[PDB]
Amino acid sequence: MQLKGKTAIVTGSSRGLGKAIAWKLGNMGANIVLNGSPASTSLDATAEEFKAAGINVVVAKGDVKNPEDVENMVKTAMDAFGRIDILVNNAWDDVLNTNLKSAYLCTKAVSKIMLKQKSGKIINITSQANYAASKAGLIGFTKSIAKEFAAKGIYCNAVAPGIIKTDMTDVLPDKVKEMYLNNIPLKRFGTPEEVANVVGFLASDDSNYITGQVINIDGGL
Amino acid sequence: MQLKGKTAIVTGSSRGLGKAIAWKLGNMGANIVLNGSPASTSLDATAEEFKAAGINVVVAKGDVKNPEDVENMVKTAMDAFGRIDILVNNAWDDVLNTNLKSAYLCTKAVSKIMLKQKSGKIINITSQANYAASKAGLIGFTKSIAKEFAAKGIYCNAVAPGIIKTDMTDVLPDKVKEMYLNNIPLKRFGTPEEVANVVGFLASDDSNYITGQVINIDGGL
Amino acid sequence: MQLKGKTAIVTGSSRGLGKAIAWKLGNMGANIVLNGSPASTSLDATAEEFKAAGINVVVAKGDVKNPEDVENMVKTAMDAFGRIDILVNNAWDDVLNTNLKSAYLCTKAVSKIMLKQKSGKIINITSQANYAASKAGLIGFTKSIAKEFAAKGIYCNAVAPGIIKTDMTDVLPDKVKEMYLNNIPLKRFGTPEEVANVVGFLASDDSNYITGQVINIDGGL
Amino acid sequence: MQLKGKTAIVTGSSRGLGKAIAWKLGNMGANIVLNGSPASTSLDATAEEFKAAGINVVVAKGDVKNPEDVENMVKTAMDAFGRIDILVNNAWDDVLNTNLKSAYLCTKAVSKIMLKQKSGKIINITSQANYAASKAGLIGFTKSIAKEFAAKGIYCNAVAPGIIKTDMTDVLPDKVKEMYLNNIPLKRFGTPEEVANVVGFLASDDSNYITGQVINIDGGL
Known part of the structure; x- marks a missing residue:
């Protein structure tokens, strides 16, 4: 389909949002590099599920907050598929390290390969003051990365989800749930699939000529 | 396809950007209501082209800056297809009347029908101080319309194109063209098809849960 | 004081916010041109109050939504003081005409004089969809005017007040008042004097090098 | 004057922008806590200059990127003046640590005292991808801090300077200087005094009711 013969790396993709994003890209025809902890019980199961659905998938085990694991991830992608068309960066000191620093390291490593291709899409997914600074930082x-690599054909955009349906939100007390729901103009939480569909758009040719942008998927919040 | 059985009204769709937008929506399976001046030489030709390509199309002739023509447009849509799922608003006194006032009148008229449906997508396309105020106004x-109709399931978003390939840009002197190109990070003009693809995204279920947003398609400008 | 020997025109300054703005500028040492309807009972009283306080004041009677009255206003300023250093623009068809069109006409007229001076500060004060479009338009x-006249030393900035204390807000039912107050992080309404103080800043040399900016004075709303 | 009997802490105030900011606040009548490295040749000279000008000044020596020095700074302020009304936060791992982490630690420490006062103003001064993320992070x-402490009367705003006159910019080659100047609508660099004047505004009662805002002082850039 839309991403036939392309390779997408999705960080933090063993479960939840990352898995949904990788699932959508996989079903658009992309070769997928899943990423997660070596200690993940779900990582291997997820890869087998993808393969059974007809998605070509390799697994890079490690923590993308560490340079050595970032290098491994890139190497397993290249060994498997020989190219990287799409990087999805999905993930006080601990907060800025987890979200923002992983995005920085992965972008730095993957950009080297995208520059040789003269092609590539980098899509950053955003995750109180610690989170706010990290989100705005990302x-x-x-916007900085987009400006820097624009001349070379490489895109960088972000997706900023509002409140998305999780295992936590499902078990929310009805009163605390109604308080959040009442603060969202659309009066419902978003879904992992909706976020995945927006990343799908940003990964496809349908979003050509869009760079340095943030798409808020938050129900008008 | 994605918009099978849905009806899209695209204002100012006899030629150029509006025609490209209507073409994309048509090819996604939507019933199309084209709009343009009764004096258009291209309007009828465009409709025949759409029909030959297998797109179900009706034509509403008039100026959408006038209430009576807006009512006609809505009536021809309803007579033809019985519903309106998508409105694309594409188009000192003359500046604010052409862009902004047409969007206001069409939204007001179509919103009545979308409220009964409890469904609908309104997509506003932006067009020196006069233009700047009009663009920011739209x-x-x-964002106002999105906030107002969110509770009822109706979406409102905008697409803001930068410099797009036209008949005018094609005949631009090479020096004036190079001056514009050098001010765009991606170092090329956008295309009508690219704008159309973004409207395609905003019209589809892939953009569910996104409201009150502006997508800049400007090559990082 | 700070504005000694300078002339400020404040539109809609017979009462309320405009009067408070003109009062602050007057007390900073500026020559003041008050503006209001010929039918104003308060305009003359306000001018006499200013004079008794030691402020040099002239009155331009008319509606600044009309070109002829705009010309009169400019002429009474020039006849009185021979220069214009500061213009404060304070004020569906009726909405866009009142706020935005008055700002456009006054700026156009005053800019001619500021260009000869190679000096000037234009400060626009913002006033549901009609209001939202007008506010964003202004x-x-x-931002457009700022960009256009930057090379010539002329500044343009805006002040965007949130909920400000008025005669209407004072008589608000306690329950409707508590609903608004609870939606403002600072948990109080703003005052006309606070807005006036921000305009005072934008009129003074303390705001040199700031152009094309909006200062939100809304208690974090 | 405006800040009589108030205490302002200005981080990184031994020289340059920080010194100019502290100078302005001092001359508005504030008690000043200067901050800089124990190794600063200029810190002591600067304090003596302030004292000779009639400014009440104490010096906190240390690096505000370290918790122990932040505690010292707060303790020297409290020992000297018994209160803190104004904190000016002026200052890949090294980039995020220098600018953003210092602001975080100082705010955290000073906020404890401002909460007891139920009064306080925190003013953050912004400093390629590393800088961009840090700036946006700050x-x-x-905006997060402003939202969090609004209920308690504590303000938080930021000042974002564009290109400001330094010792480096003064010795810039004329061609590289003309390239920067041509990219600024006002066609000149800003000055440390201009930045200081904006902080002066944000420290004074003239900026009451403004919170969670950024003032760009960049000549329209």
């Missing part, structure tokens, strides 16, 4: 980073 | 209008 | 207009 | 942090 957006500024996005 | 964006504020977009 | 902001886009502000 | 802005998001600002």
Whole structure:
């Protein structure tokens, strides 16, 4: 389909949002590099599920907050598929390290390969003051990277989800759930699939000529 | 395909960007209501082209800056297809009347029908101080409408194109063209098809849960 | 004081916010041109109050939504003081005409004089979809004018007040008042004097090098 | 004057922008806590200059990227003046640590005292991808802190300078200088005094009711 013969790396893709994003890209025809902890019980199961659905998938085990694991991830992608068309960066000190620093390291490593291709899409997914600074940081980073690599044909955009349906939100007390729901103009939580569909758009040719942008998927919040 | 059995009204769709937008929506399976001046030489030709390509199309002739023509447009849509799922608003006194006032009147008229459906997507396309105020006005209008109709399931978003390939840009002197190109990070003009693809995204279920947003398609400008 | 020997025109300054703005500028040492309807009972009283406080004041009677009255206003300023250093623009068809069109006409007229001076500060004060489009329009207009006249030393900025204390807010039912107050992080309404103080800043040399900006004075709303 | 009997802490205030900011606040009548490295040749000279000008000044020596020095700074302020009304936060791992982490630690420490006062103003001064993320991070942090402490009367705003006159810019080659100047609508660099004047505004009662805002002082850039 839309991403036939392309390779997408999705960080933090063993479960939840990352898995849904990788699932959508896989079903658009992309070769998938899943990423997660070596200690993940779900990582291997997820890969087998993808393969059974007809998605070509390799697994890079490690923590993308560490340079050595980032290098491994890139090497397993290249060994498997020989190219990287799409990087999805999905993931006080611990907060800025987890979200923002992983995005920085992965972008730095993958950009080397995208520059040789003269092609590539980098899509950053955003995750109180610690989170706010990290989120805004990732957006500024996005816009900076977009500006820097625009001349070379490489895209960088961000997706900023509002409140998305999780295992936690499902078990929310009805009163605390109604308080959040009442603060969202659309009066419902978003879904992992909706976020995945927006990343699908940003990965496809349908989003050509869009760079340095943030798409808020938050129900008008 | 994605918009099978849905009806899209695209204002100013006899030629250029509007025609490209209507073409994309048509090819996604939507019933199309084209709009343009009764004096258009291209309007009828465009409709025949769409029909030959297998797109179900009706034509509403008039100027959408006038209430009576807006009512006609809505009536021809309803007479033809019985519903309106998508409105694309594409188009000192003359500046604010052409862009912004047409968007206001069409939204007001179509919103009545979308409220009964409890479903609908309104997509506003932006067009020196006169243009700047109009553009910013249309964006504020977009965000206001989104907030107002969110509770009822109706979406409102905007697409803001930068410099797009036209008949005018093609005949631009090479020096004036190079001056514009050098001010765009991606170092090329956008295309009508690219804008059409973004409207395609905003019209489809892939953009569910996104409201009150502006997508800049400007090559990082 | 700070504005000694300078002339400020404040539109809609017979009462309320405009009067408070003109009062602050007057007390900073500026020559003041008050503006209001010929039918104003308060305009003359306000001018006499200013004079008794030691402020040099002239009155331009008319509606600044009309070109002829705009010309009169400019002429009474020039006849009185021979220069214009500061213009404060304070004020579906009726909405866009009142706020935005007055700002456009006054700026156009005053800019001719500021260009000869190679000096000047234009400060636009913002006033549901009609209001939202008008407000956003005035902001886009502000940014456009700033860009256009930057090379010539002329500044353009905007002040965007949130909920400000009025005669209407004072008589608000306690329950409707508590609903608004609870939606403002600072948990109080703003005052006309606070807005006036921000305009005072934008009129003074303390705001040199700031152009094309909007200052939100809304208690974090 | 405006800040009589108030205490302002200005981080990184031994020289340059920080010194100019502290100078302005001092001359508005504030008690000043200067901050800089124990190895600073200029810190002591600067304090003596302030004292000779009639400014009440104490010096906190240390690096505000370290918790122990932040505690010292707060303790020297409290020992000297018994209160803190104004904190000015002025200053890949090294980039995020220098700008953003110092702002975080100082705000955290000073906020404890401001909460007891139920009064306080925190003013963050912004400093390629590393800088962009840090700058955007500090802005998001600002907005978060403002939201968090609004209920308690504590303000948080940011100042974002564009290109400001330094010792480096003065010795810039004329061609590289003309390239920067041509990219600024006002066609000149800003000055440390201009930045200081904006902080002066944000420290004074003239900026009451403004919170969670960023003032760009960049000549329209």
